[PDB]
Structures are given as C-alpha cells and as structure tokens.
C-alpha cells in the first residue's frame, strides 16, 4: 500500500492534459508548466511568469509603453495535446499561445514574434474560463476550436466567443489566427455573458457547452446551451444552439459534463451533465443522448431553412441567434440534403426555441458538483463526481439501483475539484485535482479488504470476493462473488 500526490508549494493548478501515446501528464499552473510521469514524478518544469503586464497593453510589452504595468501572475488558460505539439495559452499578454514539444516541454516549437489582435486566443482574466479542442481539416491539417468567455477590460473589439484557428498555416507567424468569417459573430458580448463549461468532437462536428443570458425571452435569464458547428465549415454557416434543462425545467444551469470513457468504448455517445443552482441546494446528474442532440439540431435547421422557423401548427420553434440581422427562410425542402453545413443563401446563427429535456438519474442533497467523469466496468456504469468542498463521490448508475452513491472521500477541505478529471490509459486510476493538489486515485480499492465478510461489508461495483484466490478483487481477475449485489453468501 502506497499513494502518490503532486503539489507546488501552494501554487494553484488550472489545467491537466494527458498524452495518449506515452501517458505523460502536462499540468498548467500559475507561473508554471509541468511535465509529469504517469506516477506524478517531475520530468521537467517551465516557468511562465510572473511578467510585467496590464490587460490594457499589447504584446510585445515595451516597459516604456505600459506605465500601468505591474508584476502579473500567469494562470494557465488552455492546455491541449495535438498530434505533434502541445498547445499552451496563458492569461497574460492578451491570452497568446505557443507550441512546445511533447516529451520536451522546454523546447519551444512556435511562438509568433508579433501577434496581432487576430491571435489573442484565451481569456486574459484568470477568473474567466477558456475551453478548446483540436481537430483535423479536410487535408489533415490541425485546427484549434476555442470557446472564450467575456472579459473586455482589454483592447480591440471583443474576441468572438467561438472561433476556429489554424495551428499549421502556410506562414508560421500567422499561427493561432482565425479567418474573418470562421467565428461566431455576436453583438453585445458583455450582455450575453458567455461562460464556457466544455467542448468535444463528435462525428464531423464540434460541440460546446456554455451558459449565456437569453435576452429575447422574459426575465433576462441564464440558460444552458450546447452548440454544434461542422469542423470544415469556415463561415460558421452550420452553427446552431439548443437550450438544455433537467427535471422539467427545475434545473437549467449546467456546471460540468462528460461522456463515458472506458477500455471498451473510448468516447461514449451519452453526455452526463451535472446541474446545480449556481450562477456567475441539491445537485442532479442527467443524461443527454448525443443522438437526441443531433435530432433536435437537425429539426431546428430544417424549420428555419424551409418553414420560417415555425412548426406545422404555426408555432415558433427556431430563430436566428443573437443580434444578427437575418431571418429564417422558405427555401426548398431539399436544401438540408444538398447543403448540410449551409451556404451563403441559408440562415446562419440559428437557435432552437424548444429545449432538450432530461430526467435526473441521481440527486445529491447539500452538494454542489463541479466535475464529472464516467466509465464502465463490465457493463456497469460508474460516475466519479467532484464537488465544491473538495470531495470525490463515487456512484453506481446502470443498469440497476442507479441512486447508489457508494463512496465519498476528501481530497482537500473547502477546495473545489477541477473539471479536468482524467483517467490513465488502463482506466485503473483517476487523476483528481483541487486548487493546489493533484492526486492519483485508484478506481478499484479492492485489495484493502482481507476477509470475505470485510470485502462484502463495504459494497463497491468494482470489488468482489474471489474464492479461487483469497482476494477481494475486480471481476476480470477471476468465480466471483460481487460485493454490490452478491449472488451467494459467506462461510
């Protein structure tokens, strides 16, 4: 018996990224970037700050051009592994990015010399979240999709909330820039007040989860949305939004989400979403099949393309999103078939008026969830949930029982659990991080139990009593008496 933890003298930890080829862990922290072995041993360290800067000055920062400059810490805002480089964006210097070598983070691969206002990527405020994903273009070139919340106490026009950026363009000094129409055009960024939670790729599209204010409906309310855009759509013709809600609309603020990840299926097709009454009580976990998402998004496209965004009964079901001056249309019925990602003749920025609704698979009184990870052990579905008090809940979900919170432990008192809950390559451990601590938790703490009566007293879907060997163990190491719903008894 033995554990494994990583700390940086109280320095905060912002993001965590795992290299699927080598298992190497990259950790973004305030003024640091760390490279760790799968057992959390330090392989290399890069300093990223502090720097004399101001959210009003532009990079390069000439000390004589910025008289309001002060020593500013650099919390990490984006940390993504791409096929042939590591993508790192900080909070300083208007959120500029750089590429570093995988396995050699001290080797700088690309940092443009004079970035323009088209290359200010991440949020330059450590209190505002940036999300991102890496994908492929039509000829295999690497692309970077970014979701960035509102900050404006900086320069230029507000960076669009969602953008598509080139990682290997012809001119390397143009890296991280976006084409003029490859973005989401939104007017009052301050008022919609985007707060991004997650981003993921499914099929040939990119998806974003975020909160923003619904300004057209009454009450000026924060709502949860999922977005979808074709990966190859360079004009965002294909953009569409859907509101998400749970328990009949009682829960509409999403806090974190995840798909199921396991040895069997790497990325599942159901989105498990945590809801809580927190804005920028009881928490709930709800399930959104990604098929249902695409179904409603497809119905929204057809209705705004061909029936003026109205349903057969004449009811408004879709509309043009945000403050874009445009309109739904009466295009031919076969327009979605001919142009699934849109054209310059089709209504763009679309939003569905009809929400996608789910039922709660689990309720947690007095808990505020902040992170979600889901996996499968022999057909059973297990969720690992972090909360705002530093605890890690383990829950059995399907097929039976469902309301089965079977374990709970404290990682760091009063310190929220980070959304970047990551599993190792063999899904035997969960990397869990709070504000100042990173821990490698075992998913199956079975060998702790010595006798059958002990192995069965502490019920755990991973664990069960073998009789061939004297071990309480996982199922896939043996006849096996399950600890959760035992098939027999004891002696």
């Amino acid at each position, epitope marked *: 018996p033995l554990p494994a933890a990583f700390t940086a003298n109280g*320095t905060h930890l912002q993001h965590l990224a795992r290299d699927p080829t080598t298992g190497t862990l990259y950790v973004g922290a*305030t003024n640091f970037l760390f490279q760790l072995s799968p057992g959390l041993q330090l392989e290399a360290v890069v300093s990223t700050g502090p720097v004399n800067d101001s959210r009003d000055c532009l990079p390069p920062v000439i000390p004589d051009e910025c008289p309001q400059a002060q*020593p500013t*810490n650099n919390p990490n805002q984006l940390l993504l592994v791409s096929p042939e480089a590591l993508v790192v964006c900080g909070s300083v210097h208007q959120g500029i990015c750089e590429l570093r070598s995988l396995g050699q983070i001290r080797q700088l691969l690309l940092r443009p010399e004079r970035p323009g206002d088209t290359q200010y990527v991440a949020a330059n405020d450590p209190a505002v979240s940036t999300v991102g994903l890496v994908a492929q273009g039509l000829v295999g070139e690497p692309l970077l999709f970014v979701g960035r919340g509102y900050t404006s106490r900086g320069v230029g026009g507000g960076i669009p909330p969602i953008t598509t950026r080139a990682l290997r363009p012809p001119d390397p000094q143009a890296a991280f820039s976006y084409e003029e129409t490859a973005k989401l055009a939104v007017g009052r960024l301050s008022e919609y007040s985007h707060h991004f939670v997650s981003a993921f790729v499914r099929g040939a599209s990119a998806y974003f989860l975020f909160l923003r204010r619904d300004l057209k409906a009454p009450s000026r309310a924060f709502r949860a949305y999922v977005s979808r855009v074709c990966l190859q759509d360079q004009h965002y013709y294909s953009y569409v939004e859907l509101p998400l809600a749970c328990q009949g609309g009682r829960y509409g603020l999403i806090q974190a989400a995840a798909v199921a990840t396991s040895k069997e299926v790497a990325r599942g097709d159901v989105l498990f979403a945590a809801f809580s009454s927190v804005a920028p009580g009881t928490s709930v976990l709800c399930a959104f099949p990604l098929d249902e998402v695409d179904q409603l998004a497809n119905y929204t496209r057809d209705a705004c393309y061909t029936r003026e965004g109205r349903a057969e009964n004449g009811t408004k079901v879709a509309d043009i999103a945000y403050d874009v001056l445009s309109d739904c249309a009466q295009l031919p019925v076969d327009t979605p078939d001919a142009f699934p990602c849109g054209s310059d003749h089709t209504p763009s920025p679309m939003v569905s008026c009809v929400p996608l609704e789910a039922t709660p698979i689990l309720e947690l009184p007095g808990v505020q969830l902040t992170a979600v990870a889901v996996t499968m052990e022999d057909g059973h579905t297990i969720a690992f949930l972090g909360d705002s008090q530093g605890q890690l809940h383990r829950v059995y979900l399907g097929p039976g029982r469902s309301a089965a919170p079977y374990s709970k432990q404290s990682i760091q008192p009063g310190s929220p659990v980070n959304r970047d809950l990551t599993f190792d390559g063999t899904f035997e451990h969960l990397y869990v991080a709070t504000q100042t601590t990173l821990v490698k938790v075992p998913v199956a703490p079975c060998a702790q139990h010595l006798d059958c009566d002990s192995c069965l007293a502490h019920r755990d879907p991973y664990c069960g009593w073998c009789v061939l060997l004297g071990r309480c163990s996982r199922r896939s190491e043996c006849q096996w008496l399950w600890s959760f719903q035992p098939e027999l008894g004891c002696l």
Partner: nanobody
Framework: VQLQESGGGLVQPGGSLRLSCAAS????????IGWFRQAPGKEREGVLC????????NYADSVKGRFTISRDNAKNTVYLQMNSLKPEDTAVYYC?????????????????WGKGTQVTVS
C-alpha cells in the same frame, strides 16, 4: 471578482489607522494576500504579505515594528494595522491576491488588485 480596500484617511505623525480589504466573486482561502503602496511620482512597492494559512508573514524594512497584518478567511477580509505613521507613509494603499506559492509569504506576482485607498500623513 473584486477586491475593495477601505479605511483610508488623513492622520498626523504618530497616528494609527486600520485598513480593510474585502473580496467578492472568489474565496481568499487558498490565496496569499499582500499590501502595496504607491506614492505620487514613485513606483509601487510591497508593504506586507501573508500566506494562505496565516502562519508566514513578511515585512518591508521601512515598516517593521509598526504595521501588522491579519486575515479572516470566513469574512473574506484582510486587515492592515498601521501604527506610528510618518510622513513617508503617504501613498495610495493597494491590496492584492496571489495564487502563486501561497504556502509562502512571497507576494511577488499578483492575480487580482484593488482600486486602492489614500492615506495621508501631515
């Protein structure tokens, strides 16, 4: 996310004063907090600094024995007790929070600042 200093004023040499710094939009629990000051015409400088636990405190030379610092993680507030004030102490006093080496009382880099409060000694 906001830090708001308050309690400035105009005292004469030998006077005392107590400043507060109230945080909003985040919890100060795992942050180090420092007090800075900038006089008209000169550069900003660190005055006092405290770690997240409150067990480590660092002072600038010019204030040792006179100023003290204390924190209250439940009220999200930090206080700066200024005693035996002198004309050289006249400046705008700023409060800041740091997510960097918060177990120590370094306070070199800063995450958030306040707008400050003016303190004048005749």
């Amino acid at each position: 996310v906001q830090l708001q200093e308050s309690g400035g004023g105009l005292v004469q040499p030998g006077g005392s004063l107590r400043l507060s710094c109230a945080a909003s939009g985040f919890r100060l629990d795992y942050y180090a907090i420092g007090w800075f000051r900038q006089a008209p015409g000169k550069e900003r400088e660190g005055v006092l600094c405290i770690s997240s636990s409150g067990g480590s405190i660092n002072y600038a030379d010019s204030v040792k024995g006179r100023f003290t610092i204390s924190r209250d993680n439940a009220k999200n507030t930090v206080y700066l007790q200024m005693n035996s004030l002198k004309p050289e102490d006249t400046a705008v006093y700023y409060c800041g929070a740091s997510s960097y080496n918060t177990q120590r009382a370094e306070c070199y880099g800063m995450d958030y600042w306040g707008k400050g409060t003016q303190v004048t000694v005749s």
